Enzyme design. Structure first.
Site, PDB file in Angstrom:
ATOM      1  N   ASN A  35       0.843  -1.185   0.000  1.00  0.00           N
ATOM      2  CA  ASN A  35       0.000   0.000   0.000  1.00  0.00           C
ATOM      3  C   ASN A  35       0.886   1.245   0.000  1.00  0.00           C
ATOM      4  O   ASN A  35       2.107   1.143   0.007  1.00  0.00           O
ATOM      5  CB  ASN A  35      -0.993  -0.056   1.166  1.00  0.00           C
ATOM      6  N   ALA A  36       0.252   2.415   0.029  1.00  0.00           N
ATOM      7  CA  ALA A  36       0.933   3.697  -0.068  1.00  0.00           C
ATOM      8  C   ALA A  36       1.940   3.908   1.065  1.00  0.00           C
ATOM      9  O   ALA A  36       2.979   4.536   0.853  1.00  0.00           O
ATOM     10  CB  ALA A  36      -0.090   4.814  -0.076  1.00  0.00           C
ATOM     11  N   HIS A 117       2.855  -1.955  -5.722  1.00  0.00           N
ATOM     12  CA  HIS A 117       1.963  -1.284  -4.797  1.00  0.00           C
ATOM     13  C   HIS A 117       1.029  -0.350  -5.549  1.00  0.00           C
ATOM     14  O   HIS A 117       1.318   0.081  -6.649  1.00  0.00           O
ATOM     15  CB  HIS A 117       2.743  -0.507  -3.716  1.00  0.00           C
ATOM     16  N   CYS A 118      -0.109  -0.047  -4.930  1.00  0.00           N
ATOM     17  CA  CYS A 118      -0.900   1.132  -5.267  1.00  0.00           C
ATOM     18  C   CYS A 118      -1.227   1.827  -3.935  1.00  0.00           C
ATOM     19  O   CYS A 118      -0.347   1.946  -3.086  1.00  0.00           O
ATOM     20  CB  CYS A 118      -2.041   0.772  -6.242  1.00  0.00           C
ATOM     21  N   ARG A 119      -2.444   2.330  -3.739  1.00  0.00           N
ATOM     22  CA  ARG A 119      -2.761   3.059  -2.523  1.00  0.00           C
ATOM     23  C   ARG A 119      -3.188   2.060  -1.445  1.00  0.00           C
ATOM     24  O   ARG A 119      -2.720   2.143  -0.305  1.00  0.00           O
ATOM     25  CB  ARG A 119      -3.702   4.203  -2.941  1.00  0.00           C
TER      26      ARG A 119
END
Ligand SMILES: Oc1cc(C(F)F)ncn1
Ligand SMILES: Oc1cc(C(F)F)ncn1
Length: 179
Positions: A35-36, A117-119
């Site tokens: 994640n972010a 990853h993304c948010r």
């Protein structure tokens, strides 16, 4: 193979998708989804042994992570940014080849470890990782999605799922799904 089959595979007995417990997980050997906050925490990234970061949501919006290669300059981490959106109409499959090549290059390195990853680490990044497993490790879509899901609670949107089904048929016909 249908989207419905993939929806089922992502659902618990109750009928519901789940949600990520952790900020990231290793979903296959040396491939992390996250994640972010892990992405922006270089100390954590070293403790995890991360050498490469694939930002599958590069951007300025609330649904994006506003990093770039410079962010990681003096850390010795190698970066690739993909400006993907998490919508059923977004064409993520256009990115599969370049994402797959980056992940192959990371793992070619002896002690290489890649964080995709993304948010939320729930939709874009797992789609890229699945497509990689299908295109480079010859895993069919059901087993690829099953293994990633076994190791991180994920839920790619139904557009992305459709795009993994399309990919799966092509590979099957090309005889590329036989490990
Ligand atoms: O060597 C491997 C193993 C796996 C996992 F399924 F266990 N995935 C990809 N490459
Ligand atoms: O984060 C997770 C997810 C799972 C899944 F199987 F439900 N298992 C272990 N850790």
């Amino acid at each position: 193979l249908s989207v419905q089959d993939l929806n089922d595979l992502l659902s618990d007995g109750s009928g519901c998708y789940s949600l990520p417990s952790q900020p990231c997980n290793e979903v296959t050997p040396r491939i992390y989804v996250g994640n972010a906050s892990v992405a922006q925490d270089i100390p954590k990234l070293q403790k995890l042994g991360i050498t490469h970061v694939l930002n599958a949501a590069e951007g300025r919006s609330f649904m994006h992570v506003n990093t770039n290669a410079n962010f990681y300059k003096d850390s010795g981490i190698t970066y690739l940014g993909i400006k993907a959106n998490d919508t059923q109409e977004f064409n993520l499959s256009a990115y599969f080849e370049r994402a797959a090549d980056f992940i192959d290059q990371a793992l070619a390195q002896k002690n290489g470890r890649v964080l995709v990853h993304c948010r939320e680490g729930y939709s874009r990044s797992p789609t890229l990782v699945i497509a990689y497993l299908m295109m480079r490790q010859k895993m069919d879509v059901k087993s690829a999605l099953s293994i990633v899901r076994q190791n991180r609670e994920i839920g790619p949107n139904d557009g992305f799922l459709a795009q993994l089904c399309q990919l799966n048929d092509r590979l099957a016909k090309e005889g590329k799904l036989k490990p």
